[PDB]
């Protein structure tokens, strides 16, 4: 190739300038339509330049793949390269014209250039009676030390309303000499906060205005000492510095002073109190009651509007702020037509209107985010509203979208995990599913937060939901990525879509396993529509590997399903592929990975729903260690010395098959596991129910997986004496036995698991269990489920200090022993939780 | 050459404009991403232009080296010159476009466009009880005159916390009538400071607000006279003018008033008090205790977090500010995963987050630096974290990097020594090693300061640490220089690096002498990767002189190791070379310097680990005096009349070999030392243990090295009577005798060393020593080591006025005499220190 490399480089520099401008404009608040048009044009120009460069790189790589004879004799390559160079030159001319003509594209040194409601009467507050009672009981408990009870929750959940309800409660007056309210806020000055606190004790604050912060703290402490027990309410705390400053205004008189603070941050609340108070969500009934109180005040709802109102209140997610905004939409419109209109799209009516109260309140928390976490938050709105987002899937989508910039000491997966946990801690992501590690398993976006992400991503052109009003298309040409539900897929494809600029295609099955009437021609049309697609995350389909699919060389993420007997060699030409998630309905016991994954240097995660029969690297493929981090459902046959050596950086590994033929001496494929350097999770599964002999844990197993933190055994059918071998694992932290992993009437462990935190037993047909303290010194969780034959969980566990959680699911008489242990620990007054189902 | 010289000159002028802009932008705070992109582009353009000019200059020099026939017949030179001219023209066009298109590159006349914590209860302070007691004992000592006790230390070390602890101490209340606290600060007005001081004595400061500074000083003096003994605490003093102003507010009533000031500057503290109080660093235990107090307040650390917390606290360097910042990172996160994440990289978690408290506090001291000292400070971050930086090496790296601009009266080495000492005096560099001269031998960067330098250098593109996350490379293309540890060298080279823009390559062996598995091909790859490298500081290797190494004509600094029997002539073509540090493992006794160093006009320092057998300059090489400043390990054979004449400006000289054949009459190579005009240091070493005869100091020796300040004799085996000849040296300031330098049972010196300051004896097998006062009139240090046979250090030295330091290392009974002298001087109450090991 000639000068086109220099043209590419110059275009990249200019596009870097344009992207810097776009990042800057994302900060600038704009009310000008011409500014909006210019930013749209620059975004489109950046996208076009990126697509052109990517096409050029792909063509150069494909040419270099071809042999020298084919390289010379391919005139079609010459025509394509000339066309791509012409396109690059045109885009570069456009970018230069953009920068030259517009004075807004001039760089500037430092120049980006950027009250509560009426007052609720105690009957205007809905559903907070029990919550207020709980917080009041916590506040009025006698204790010598200062105690902070933080009320924490998502924006507009009612933290300030509950704090005001408690602050006005008569009960507090009997217990506390002084009950003061202080508003801190995000932007606050501690001198002002202390002066406001001082007003509650002296009316001569015009005398103390000249004092310093510490002097004012001492003055307030003396006043409180003169008074007695005091409760100071801090509103809207966004830093720990406030908590630390306020600790200094309370005298050490052992009276039991209190602070009730409200915050959106769970980490700040956990600093304030190891047990922060999570404000509840209103029930649908309470939501409807609040809606009726907001719309009709004290008058009852008209009968004809009750059904619509109940529908509307249930669509607000139980967050009072949403109900208040929707009420503002329904105020003074007792007509059924207006209520039907609002019911049709309630989340839209949040963030619209001047009373868009959701927008500014959500933006309070949003602006507090770092840029990477900000962008990662928006891509949570790529899932359907109400979708139970898998944490692993969203993490891998963030990484595949380039949202996570690599850091020196952390893997991209670790950074993404931290970002997701930070979003949950800031109460911007709802988490209802916990892994045994204590990490997020599935998360969710609240309807109001989801609508915020959906609008913000559309404003920033990150992605866009394909929504059709009977016919028509809504500008799909104004979106880098497209999300479409399976119901709307057929209609969209019937238009014969052709969007080169679209880079990610999302089809999420919220109604799981509702594969609609999509034909192979529709899948081929999907392939045709997006040739530059980087992320293809569509698992509700019967995907087929057409010849057009083999040309999606830009892919970084694929989540597909169908009837695949093997991964074709064509997958090996996706040199950008990072995540490969497969779900094959084929009856074949294992999936043949024909693709030479080892030469896919970018590949990090491979997920298959049946065991994968990998191929050992050839002598040519030898080189550096592979980037692979996850290898799920790998057949024991494929765990060879070379396979494991190339993937020595593997972190999660799952094996399923004939384990017996894997734990033997000449079966040292198990011994090949030593090649791994950072193996954290290991799943060992057995498929056969009839066993020639009961397998055995090799004596080498202790140091074969010494780095493993999570170990899962399934259908292994091991003698309970074989569990003693797992105690020699130094890093074993979470341990799972499921589906008759260990066989035997009783388990009498002797070895102690030095670091085990979570013990997990499922469907264990054992009868008795005589563990002791030495066996699990640092146990923290004990999850037994489907243990219909277990007799009694040993009392010896009751003496374990760190143990504070234990769940018995579908458990026999052993439940009674769990009650006995709970009773003993309650007698000792140790924080403990015991869950029983049903 | 044709017009290309004019093109070079015009490109140089435009690059001067761009560099001026870069210097300006370094001052401008910027939040615009487009601004960052533009600055990056201009930096890359400046680097590219510099590289092009350098390539052109070296090519012109190489052509001029060739003979006229070769010059005319070298078509390859014509092609290379045409390519270089085309590159220069392209870079000039790019620079012109940069200046024309961007309105931020317009020159403007003058237009660059630029609270404490809560409060600690004395139980929240860790490890300062003894320090506070020491400072209080110093304060409450009875003395007639005003006494200032400065608490000095590095940023965030806790000077203000200890000052507050002392200010709150009850003990001070008994001793002092008034104990006031004044905050001065970097930006301060003396009128405001005096008015604040006045408030402590009168509540009518609204009456005195109109007085002048001297009038207010007199008023405060009268108030203090009325009161009694007073202690005024000055916080954050950055100038001596504050000290002088505050001296005027204390009446001369002989009561013993005190001032306790805190500062980061050791020179300011030494002005305030000849014995300033150096605040301690927290021990790892105290650091963990402080971390637990900051994270969990008064509750104990959870057991599962104690190991992670202890690891984290030990990575904070004993500076409380670092522990406070890391606590802010760990607050409200009692999960082992968060603590593991923070432990993985603790120094990163300083300077990140809004509570980046390290950043602003370090910037306070950094901005106080001059630009040259600022840049020299950052290049201390090229060394590994925790590396013991050699002073000579960092000085020579600063000079080789162009950081020191020559001054009229000072050599570059003197300016660099001053800069390093200034960085130590500002408490920005940690010094723990002192030369006998009292200068810094090795220094260190605190982990928090090191991270500041690392980040700041990366932000300014000065250098960059090559760090790989398993695979990958982090933008190496966005750095002028690259530092890589030997562990990461092999992985980096396997990528086949080719970085023309990289100008310095650093490989520092913090784990000393851990030469890993690097092959000759790796060394050749190092040579290939950086052809424009100016600085090559890599001594943990077996370097080999390949043909590619011979083409690094830009080299200004080389520090290499291997098996070299001689320096090839190819080193003579490094016309830019200043420092040549060699460590050759060859068994051959000396190093043959084949390269014609005398024509290497820029050469300043030559260091070899074995004696160097230089070659006398030829009649052609005659000319000006050589720039050589250091000639270490030069064989006595090479010290000839012409060799010594060409290097008359030499300052350090080291000789090792057969001294007897060097001190003789016909051996007047010793007499050739007269040719030196500024010889400061002389080392004379002996290699032979069997001597035909005991050598003799020539009677001419007194005026042979008359300019020498430091003299080192090793293995010479001289009669103790020969030490009397060294007393005639006018400038002899430091004298070292090591490894049986002088042989004899006893030493009875008669001559007196008029200017000797430091007397250093190592492994002297003499028995008795009967020195007297006249012998060492101005002695200041007497350091004896391995004197297992010395009987008693004479009491006569106890009467020496200037002597205040004496160290006996592995010393026999003579230790008892040292104790006697210490006792006598303590009786006289003279400041003295006596160190004994073990
Ligand atoms: N239980 C409730 N009953 C009635 N209105 C409520 C309730 N909880 C909240 N609100 C409404 O919320 C608004 C008051 O702020 P709110 O108490 O919701 O904020 P918060 O939870 O402290 O959140 P943030 O301060 O982060 O915005 C008013 O519209 C109030 O009517
Ligand atoms: N011994 C200590 N125990 C507890 N906290 C400490 C201790 N020393 C310092 N700190 C805390 O560390 C942080 C920095 O310390 P401090 O402000 O006293 O430092 P300083 O030496 O005066 O520095 P600067 O030059 O910035 O004024 C503050 O939060 C201080 O409270």
């Amino acid at each position: 190739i000639g000068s086109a490399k220099g043209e590419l480089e110059n275009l990249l520099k200019e596009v870097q300038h344009l992207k810097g401008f776009l990042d800057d404009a994302a900060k600038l608040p704009s009310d000008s339509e011409q500014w909006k048009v210019l930013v749209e044009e620059i975004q489109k120009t950046v996208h076009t330049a990126e697509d052109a460069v990517d096409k050029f790189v792909v063509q150069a790589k494909l040419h270099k793949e071809k042999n020298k004879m084919a390289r010379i004799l391919d005139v079609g390559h010459l025509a394509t390269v000339r066309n791509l160079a012409a396109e690059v030159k045109g885009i570069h001319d456009q970018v230069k014209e953009l920068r030259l003509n517009n004075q807004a594209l001039q760089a500037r040194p430092t120049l980006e250039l950027p009250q509560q409601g009426p007052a609720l009467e105690d009957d205007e507050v809905v559903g907070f009676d029990e919550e207020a009672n709980k917080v009041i009981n916590r506040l009025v408990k006698e204790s010598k030390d200062l105690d902070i009870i933080p009320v924490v929750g998502m924006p507009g959940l009612g933290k300030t309303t509950l704090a005001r309800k408690i602050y006005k409660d008569p009960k507090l007056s009997y217990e506390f000499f002084g009950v003061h309210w202080v508003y801190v806020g995000q932007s606050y000055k501690i001198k002002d906060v202390f002066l406001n606190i001082l007003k509650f004790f002296t009316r001569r604050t015009e005398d103390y205005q000249h004092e310093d912060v510490d002097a004012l703290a001492k003055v307030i402490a003396g006043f409180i000492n003169k008074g007695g027990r005091c409760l100071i309410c801090l509103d809207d705390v966004w830093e720990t510095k406030v908590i630390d400053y306020v600790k200094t205004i309370f005298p050490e008189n052992e009276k039991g002073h209190r602070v009730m603070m409200t915050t959106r941050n769970k980490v700040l609340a956990t600093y304030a109190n190891s047990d922060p108070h999570d404000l509840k969500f209103l029930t649908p009934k309470e939501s409807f009651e609040l809606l009726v109180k907001r719309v009709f005040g004290k008058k009852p709802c008209p009968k004809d509007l009750v059904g619509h109102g109940e529908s509307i209140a249930g669509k607000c997610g139980g967050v009072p702020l949403a109900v208040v905004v929707i009420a503002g939409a329904l105020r003074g419109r007792p007509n059924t037509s207006d209520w039907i209109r609002v019911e049709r799209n309630v989340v839209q009516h949040l963030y619209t209107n001047s009373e868009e109260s959701c927008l500014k309140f959500v933006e309070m928390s949003y602006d507090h985010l770092p840029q990477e976490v900000q962008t990662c938050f928006l891509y949570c709105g790529v899932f359907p509203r109400g979708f139970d987002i898998p944490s692993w899937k969203v993490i891998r989508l963030w990484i595949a979208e380039g949202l996570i910039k690599p850091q020196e000491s952390y893997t991209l997966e670790e950074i993404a995990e931290f970002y997701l946990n930070d979003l949950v801690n800031r109460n911007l992501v709802i988490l209802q599913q916990k892994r045994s590690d204590g990490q997020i398993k599935t998360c969710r976006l609240h309807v109001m937060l989801h609508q915020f992400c959906k609008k913000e991503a559309s404003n920033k052109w990150l992605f866009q939901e394909v929504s059709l009003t009977p016919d028509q298309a809504i500008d799909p040409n104004k979106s880098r990525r497209l999300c479409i539900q399976p119901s709307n897929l057929k209609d969209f494809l019937s238009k014969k879509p052709s969007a080169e600029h679209v880079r990610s295609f999302y089809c999420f099955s919220s109604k799981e396993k509702q594969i609609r009437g999509l034909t192979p021609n529709d899948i081929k049309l999907i392939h045709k529509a997006f040739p530059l697609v980087r992320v293809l995350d569509v698992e509700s389909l019967k995907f087929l590997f057409s010849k057009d699919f083999n040309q999606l060389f830009h892919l970084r993420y694929i989540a597909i399903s169908g009837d695949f007997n093997a991964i074709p060699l064509t997958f090996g030409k996706f040199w950008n592929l990072q995540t490969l998630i497969l779900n094959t309905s084929t009856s074949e016991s294992t999936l043949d990975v024909k693709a030479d994954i080892w030469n896919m240097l970018q590949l990090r995660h491979l997920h298959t729903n049946i065991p994968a029969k990998l191929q050992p690297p050839t002598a040519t493929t030898s080189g550096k260690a592979s980037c692979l981090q996850t290898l799920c459902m790998v057949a024991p046959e494929s765990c060879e010395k070379e396979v494991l050596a190339k993937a020595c950086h593997l972190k999660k590994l799952s094996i399923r098959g004939q384990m017996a033929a894997f734990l033997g001496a000449y079966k040292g494929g198990i011994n090949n596991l030593v090649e791994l350097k950072c193996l954290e999770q290991l799943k060992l599964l057995n498929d056969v129910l009839y066993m020639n002999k009961a397998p055995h844990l090799p004596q080498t197993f202790s140091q074969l997986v010494r780095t493993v933190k999570k170990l899962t055994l399934t259908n292994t059918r091991f003698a309970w004496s074989e569990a003693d071998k797992l105690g020699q694992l130094e890093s074993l932290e979470i341990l799972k036995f499921k589906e008759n992993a260990f066989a035997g009437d009783s388990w009498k462990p002797k070895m102690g698991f030095s670091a085990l935190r979570v013990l997990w037993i499922e469907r264990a047909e054992f009868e008795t269990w005589e563990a002791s303290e030495i066996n699990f010194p640092v146990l923290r969780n004990l999850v037994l489920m489907s243990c219909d034959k277990l007799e009694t969980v040993p009392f010896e566990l009751a003496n374990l200090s760190d143990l504070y959680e234990m769940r018995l699911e579908n458990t026999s008489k052993a439940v009674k022993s769990a009650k006995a242990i709970l009773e003993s620990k309650t007698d000792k007054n140790i924080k403990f939780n015991l869950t029983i189902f049903p």
Side-chain angles (χ1 to χ4, degrees), chain A:
Chain A
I1 295 167
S3 64
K5 210 164 182 179
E7 256 283 5
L8 248 61
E9 297 338 281
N10 263 56
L11 175 54
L12 297 214
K13 320 210 312 311
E14 308 268 335
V15 168
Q16 256 47 77
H17 279 86
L18 294 194
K19 291 174 79 138
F21 168 83
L22 289 167
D23 290 315
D24 278 26
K27 331 293 276 306
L28 306 172
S30 62
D31 44 2
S32 304
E33 299 299 311
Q34 202 172 15
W35 183 257
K36 275 173 55 45
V37 177
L38 174 61
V39 181
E40 287 160 36
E41 184 196 54
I42 292 160
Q43 188 59 261
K44 263 182 279 181
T45 315
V46 165
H47 290 166
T48 321
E50 289 167 3
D51 292 356
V53 163
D54 295 4
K55 288 172 172 182
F56 203 103
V57 168
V58 171
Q59 281 303 342
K61 276 195 58 40
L62 283 174
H63 203 208
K64 293 315 305 317
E65 276 181 8
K66 289 189 189 193
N67 291 315
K68 295 180 182 180
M69 178 210 167
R71 282 179 207 167
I72 292 158
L73 297 170
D74 190 357
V75 173
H77 153 278
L78 305 172
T80 306
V81 159
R82 273 138 206 70
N83 268 317
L84 290 176
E87 203 45 282
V88 158
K89 211 216 181 83
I91 293 168
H92 191 196
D93 284 23
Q94 190 176 321
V95 170
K96 281 188 290 193
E97 169 263 320
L98 275 166
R99 275 154 56 68
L100 179 102
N101 290 5
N102 295 281
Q103 245 283 339
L105 270 163
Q106 290 296 325
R108 312 121 65 180
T110 120
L111 285 318
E112 96 288 35
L113 201 100
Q115 190 208 97
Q116 315 276 253
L120 267 58
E121 180 193 54
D122 285 294
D123 43 289
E124 300 179 13
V125 182
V126 195
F128 281 13
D129 293 348
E130 259 76 4
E131 288 268 294
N133 284 348
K134 289 178 166 187
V135 184
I136 287 158
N137 287 4
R138 283 191 71 192
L139 287 168
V140 304
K141 210 174 232 82
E142 210 88 62
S143 163
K144 329 305 132 196
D145 299 65
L146 167 66
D147 203 46
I148 311 191
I149 282 73
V151 180
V152 53
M154 63 167 281
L157 192 62
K159 316 179 284 287
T160 308
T161 302
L162 185 75
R164 274 264 172 229
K165 181 173 166 61
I166 292 152
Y167 164 87
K168 289 169 171 196
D169 206 282
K171 288 159 107 294
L172 284 196
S173 75
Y174 319 159
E175 301 281 351
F176 293 85
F177 160 95
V179 192
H180 196 26
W181 181 279
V182 187
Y183 173 82
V184 187
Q186 214 179 332
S187 75
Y188 83 106
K189 331 202 78 58
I190 206 72
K191 208 208 199 327
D192 298 336
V193 162
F194 280 176
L195 289 167
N196 268 253
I197 292 160
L198 201 44
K199 278 168 199 57
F200 177 58
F201 297 102
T202 174
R203 283 269 57 261
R204 322 314 325 296
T205 285
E206 64 244 74
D207 174 25
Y208 291 107
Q209 78 306 330
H210 59 100
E211 302 280 30
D212 79 79
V213 278
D214 190 359
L216 285 168
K218 303 267 258 300
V219 174
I220 295 163
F223 272 108
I224 288 157
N225 204 34
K226 282 180 254 171
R229 216 193 178 181
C230 188
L231 168 62
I232 281 168
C233 312
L234 303 175
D235 204 47
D236 219 23
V237 187
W238 289 73
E239 337 179 17
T240 56
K241 205 170 174 175
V242 186
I243 295 159
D244 297 345
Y245 266 108
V246 165
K247 284 167 172 189
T248 69
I249 69 162
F250 286 95
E252 285 260 0
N253 49 15
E254 296 79 42
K255 279 219 52 163
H257 305 282
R258 298 284 177 259
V259 171
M260 180 183 41
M261 50 172 275
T262 69
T263 182
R264 295 168 182 190
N265 195 302
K266 283 152 92 99
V267 171
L268 182 51
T270 302
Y271 178 54
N273 207 279
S274 58
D275 176 27
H277 178 80
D278 267 337
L279 179 64
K280 72 174 222 172
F281 284 85
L282 291 186
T283 58
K285 275 171 51 50
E286 293 168 343
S287 289
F288 175 68
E289 174 173 346
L290 173 56
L291 184 81
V292 179
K293 275 183 174 158
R294 294 282 155 158
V295 181
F296 305 108
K298 283 126 160 72
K299 332 197 80 57
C301 189
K303 270 72 222 173
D304 46 290
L305 307 173
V306 163
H308 310 276
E310 288 172 335
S311 177
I312 289 157
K315 288 175 165 186
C316 282
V319 164
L321 175 68
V323 191
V324 171
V325 172
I326 291 289
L330 294 163
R331 281 266 190 70
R333 305 182 146 90
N335 335 296
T336 308
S337 40
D338 295 302
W339 286 58
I340 287 164
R341 170 192 109 247
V342 172
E343 183 198 7
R344 275 204 218 304
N345 217 157
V346 152
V347 280
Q348 278 284 338
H349 283 87
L350 324 171
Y351 308 98
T352 59
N353 182 354
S354 60
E355 201 241 4
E356 63 178 351
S357 304
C358 294
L359 177 62
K360 36 152 178 299
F361 296 138
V362 170
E363 262 177 352
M364 249 194 283
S365 221
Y366 182 63
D367 296 351
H368 209 62
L369 288 164
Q371 190 89 13
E372 300 229 274
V373 195
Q374 274 198 349
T375 316
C376 288
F377 177 52
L378 299 179
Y379 281 78
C380 283
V382 92
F383 299 86
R385 193 152 66 233
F387 198 71
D388 273 350
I389 307 173
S391 65
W392 64 277
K393 219 173 217 215
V394 65
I395 278 158
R396 291 185 222 302
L397 287 161
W398 290 347
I399 295 155
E401 293 282 13
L403 309 181
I404 314 300
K405 292 193 168 180
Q407 293 167 20
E408 161 190 350
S409 300
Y410 310 105
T411 82
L412 296 171
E413 287 76 15
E414 280 172 333
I415 298 151
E417 215 161 64
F418 172 66
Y419 283 3
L420 184 72
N421 271 273
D422 199 25
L423 287 171
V424 170
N425 282 330
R426 295 156 117 98
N427 281 295
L428 289 175
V429 167
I430 288 162
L431 137 73
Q432 78 308 30
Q433 264 263 59
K434 266 295 196 202
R435 283 211 240 98
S436 284
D437 317 48
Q439 309 270 51
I440 299 146
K441 182 176 162 192
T442 75
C443 62
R444 196 164 44 72
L445 274 187
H446 197 259
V447 282
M448 93 161 41
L449 274 312
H450 186 279
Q451 178 60 15
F452 174 84
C453 292
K454 169 168 167 177
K455 289 179 135 147
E456 191 72 357
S458 294
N459 292 342
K460 312 259 154 273
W461 303 292
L462 310 178
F463 57 80
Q464 188 180 93
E465 168 197 311
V466 172
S467 47
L468 304 321
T469 194
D471 293 355
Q472 313 182 344
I474 273 240
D475 196 4
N477 298 276
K478 214 196 304 311
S479 49
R480 196 58 157 151
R481 304 165 185 77
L482 282 184
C483 332
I484 190 157
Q485 309 240 32
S487 46
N488 302 328
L489 181 52
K490 163 151 286 309
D491 314 342
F492 181 86
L493 286 182
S494 66
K495 194 215 68 48
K496 309 183 180 180
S498 268
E500 320 318 329
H501 69 297
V502 170
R503 292 297 207 122
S504 316
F505 181 54
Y506 304 108
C507 205
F508 290 110
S509 91
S510 50
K511 310 180 180 180
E512 293 178 42
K513 302 195 171 180
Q514 284 198 348
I515 307 180
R516 295 173 177 270
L518 274 285
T519 75
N521 209 332
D522 301 314
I523 271 59
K524 273 142 215 101
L525 261 185
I526 275 158
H527 302 155
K528 267 174 73 272
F530 321 110
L532 305 184
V533 67
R534 294 190 244 97
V535 171
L536 197 38
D537 156 23
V538 294
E539 290 179 350
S540 24
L541 295 177
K542 180 164 165 166
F543 219 45
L544 303 162
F545 302 127
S546 90
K547 322 304 304 310
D548 279 8
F549 173 86
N550 310 0
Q551 308 285 290
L552 311 185
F553 304 104
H554 303 80
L555 282 164
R556 333 248 308 271
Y557 183 108
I558 331 171
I560 45 143
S561 64
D563 162 51
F564 324 116
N565 306 343
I567 314 183
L569 217 176
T570 61
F571 271 80
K573 302 341 265 173
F574 301 153
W575 85 97
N576 272 118
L577 188 60
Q578 304 173 222
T579 309
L580 180 53
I581 298 143
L582 274 144
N583 305 111
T584 165
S585 52
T586 203
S587 310
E588 208 182 287
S589 63
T590 94
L591 192 75
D592 215 333
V593 178
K594 298 147 77 63
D596 182 61
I597 53 159
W598 310 122
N599 291 159
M600 314 210 279
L601 321 181
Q602 310 287 41
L603 189 73
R604 290 166 80 66
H605 316 279
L606 166 60
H607 300 103
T608 62
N609 71 313
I610 63 175
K613 269 182 97 310
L614 269 75
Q615 30 81 30
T618 72
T620 55
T621 64
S622 65
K624 227 157 284 171
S626 183
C627 261
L628 253 173
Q629 320 288 321
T630 299
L631 230 44
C632 266
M633 281 324 270
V634 176
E637 188 278 336
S638 29
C639 292
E640 285 223 336
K641 167 80 94 61
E642 321 90 51
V643 171
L644 262 300
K646 241 289 189 175
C648 39
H649 295 220
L650 209 68
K651 318 224 180 208
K652 181 172 176 180
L653 176 59
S654 290
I655 319 181
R656 184 170 92 123
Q658 315 311 341
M659 303 262 91
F662 192 54
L663 287 312
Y666 187 75
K667 315 310 201 174
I670 177 48
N671 304 123
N672 298 170
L673 273 292
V674 301
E675 297 294 336
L676 313 156
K677 302 176 176 184
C678 290
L679 179 70
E680 303 196 307
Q681 314 189 28
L682 177 64
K683 299 196 166 193
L684 303 174
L685 293 96
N686 231 10
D687 273 0
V688 65
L689 303 180
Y690 316 103
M691 254 288 150
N692 292 310
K693 295 186 186 179
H696 304 288
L697 272 292
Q699 312 319 87
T700 319
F701 187 82
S702 311
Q703 78 284 27
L704 285 183
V705 303
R706 53 216 282 289
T707 319
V708 152
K709 294 173 182 174
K710 186 164 171 184
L711 191 279
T712 311
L713 308 177
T714 326
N715 186 4
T716 43
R717 317 181 158 292
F718 266 119
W720 279 117
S721 72
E722 307 249 320
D724 272 32
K725 329 296 214 303
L726 302 172
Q728 297 184 355
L729 292 160
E730 298 193 325
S731 323
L732 185 57
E733 236 170 38
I734 296 104
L735 190 53
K736 294 202 167 179
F737 313 115
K738 329 207 297 292
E739 293 306 332
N740 332 316
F742 274 85
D745 299 345
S746 69
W747 183 23
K748 296 76 43 177
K750 302 180 177 175
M751 215 87 76
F753 309 80
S754 63
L756 189 76
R757 326 162 65 81
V758 179
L759 186 77
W760 190 298
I761 328 291
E762 178 182 347
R763 283 195 71 267
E765 82 298 355
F766 65 169
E767 281 56 78
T768 60
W769 185 29
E770 273 90 65
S772 78
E773 287 74 350
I774 202 171
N775 281 126
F776 319 92
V778 299
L779 202 72
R780 190 183 316 290
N781 231 296
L782 182 64
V783 177
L784 314 170
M785 70 215 204
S786 307
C787 298
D788 307 342
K789 288 67 52 182
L790 180 58
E791 282 301 341
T792 169
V793 47
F795 213 152
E796 297 85 320
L797 298 178
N799 323 50
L800 275 183
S801 55
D802 306 19
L803 165 56
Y804 63 69
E805 202 176 341
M806 162 169 338
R807 315 172 65 271
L808 269 49
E809 272 276 355
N810 327 315
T811 300
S812 77
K813 307 140 185 167
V815 57
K816 194 177 180 182
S817 55
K819 308 310 309 317
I821 279 81
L822 173 277
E823 288 162 16
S824 179
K825 267 194 173 295
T826 308
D827 306 347
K828 177 58 58 46
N829 299 298
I830 283 159
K831 186 185 176 187
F832 189 91
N833 179 297
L834 170 48
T835 301
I836 280 290
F837 165 99

